[PDB]
Design a binder for this molecule. Structure first.
Ligand code: SF4
Ligand code: SF4
Ligand code: SF4
Ligand code: NI
Ligand code: NI
Ligand code: NI
Ligand code: NI
Ligand code: NI
Ligand code: NI
Ligand code: NI
Lengths: 109, 85, 109, 109, 85, 85
């Protein structure tokens, strides 16, 4: 109900990535940008799509999908909204979760 | 830190003036043409020209590479002209 | 069916916390104590409650809820039953799980 | 839908073990071998079975079940198919998952 | 170890004599008044007076702080009187 | 590395010649008797006799212990005879 998460390592740094916090990241994108992300990386069904397959979905060229992807990555890293990304990438901390509050009560302060 | 070339963006982004704003002040909707476009850019730039980390923002966008958005008080086309001519 | 768990870090120590082992911890409390814990930290629905909201649930004062919370924390740390807490906090070990038994078979001894 | 996983530590080495990758490991076994594994370690229902209980299931002796288990472990470690085991034991890497692809897009290269 | 002031409780709790018992010997049900209360406390204390880690238990409860329960052969009110007067 | 005695199998298995094959060339179906059995073994062995890590495979099976399968160009019974007599 909130538990779905993934463990990943990229260049020997580890991440715990919560589905709910990914949804908060995607919510900052346009509907088409978020859909391109979901199709490109296989978030919808585990299966990545090619740029041409995604362009078929949205009625645009492969090159426009490439540009949509590029614009999305710039959007996700922009300082205006990049705290949502920071929160997602720091999922291993459990900050603001019921269990972290409980443990702080048990341990004091 | 983060892996890759963006390893150090958190060093400066936490001081950015735009930190609370919707990304719409800094990115053009897909269809935008004419007046609206430029009026969006100059609004974004008025903020950058007050921002304490404008130099780090500008340097990230030009040297690490951000193809879209207003960064460091520079528009997309300004940066494309500087980098590719 | 047993997988729901949370990753949390408190003062740079990391924990893996299984919902089934949390249920075993709560089972050692009275029904009202366990309910106060669930409401206070948002285990029921992700949303913490104030002491006054919880007192409304149980028909008691905010101060009685504060005392119920305090008594609960003493109960959870008491040496009589604190092994259930130890087991919960050591969830990253996977001890007594099907997968840990399988891996010990594959690896030997 | 792919998230079910377990965290285990064996002799101070930690593993993240995905149910989908365990299924790929079991798929390389015979139906009876995979069933013996599931019953012996409690993968079906959290509850390990004795060798005699499993022999009752398959109509064979306790000693034949011991031999089936031994043969299974040799099969899982044989160099012919041991990459499926390697993939399972390396689940903490998240390699080939949607989230790892997404993070590599965000981070570059 | 654990974070916070309770960092080291596992050093001694594994030797406590009460380790198997229900918490009911050491904590009063919410409503309890009169005879029952005191009879519960003295039963708990008979165990503590046989326990090998009574000193560590008592020290944890008084110095780190446990407001409820019998710890170290001391009742809740005994500890409250010692600490606050 | 892995825990236990199989800690180091990945050092050599990635070079094994059988790496792509179904385990059926190296393990007998449960019921197998007569001709089929031996014909399976000699096929597996023809591969081992071409394999670059045959020595490491053979050593793992005999010294660390693999009761089932063809390893290192040796059958199950060959290894059982060598180890137990
Ligand atoms: S320079 Fe502009 S875009 Fe960069 S952080 Fe400052 S306000 Fe935001
Ligand atoms: S002193 Fe009493 S409460 Fe403390 S561990 Fe010993 S028996 Fe338990
Ligand atoms: S010696 Fe035979 S069983 Fe061992 S890795 Fe080589 S081919 Fe495979
Ligand atoms: Ni959930
Ligand atoms: Ni939960
Ligand atoms: Ni589960
Ligand atoms: Ni499971
Ligand atoms: Ni996990
Ligand atoms: Ni899933
Ligand atoms: Ni997922």
């Amino acid at each position: 109900a909130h538990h779905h998460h993934h463990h990943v390592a990229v260049d020997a740094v580890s991440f715990t990535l919560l589905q709910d916090q990914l949804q908060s990241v995607l919510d900052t994108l346009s509907e088409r940008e978020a859909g391109v992300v979901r199709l490109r990386f296989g978030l919808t069904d585990g299966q990545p799509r090619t740029l041409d397959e995604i362009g078929q979905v949205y009625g645009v060229t492969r090159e426009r999908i490439r540009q949509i992807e590029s614009k999305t990555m710039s959007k996700l890293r922009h300082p205006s909204r990049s705290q949502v990304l920071r929160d997602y990438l720091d999922g291993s901390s459990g900050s603001g979760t019921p269990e972290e509050r409980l443990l702080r009560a048990i341990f004091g302060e | 830190q983060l892996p890759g070339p963006n390893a150090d963006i958190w060093n400066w982004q936490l001081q950015g003036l735009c930190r609370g704003m919707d990304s719409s002040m800094f990115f053009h909707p897909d269809g935008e043409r004419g007046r609206a476009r430029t009026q969006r850019e100059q609004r974004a730039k008025e903020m950058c020209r007050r921002c304490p980390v404008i130099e780090a923002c500008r340097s990230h966008a030009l040297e690490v590479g951000e193809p879209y958005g207003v960064w460091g008080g520079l528009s997309e086309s300004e940066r494309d002209l500087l980098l590719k001519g």
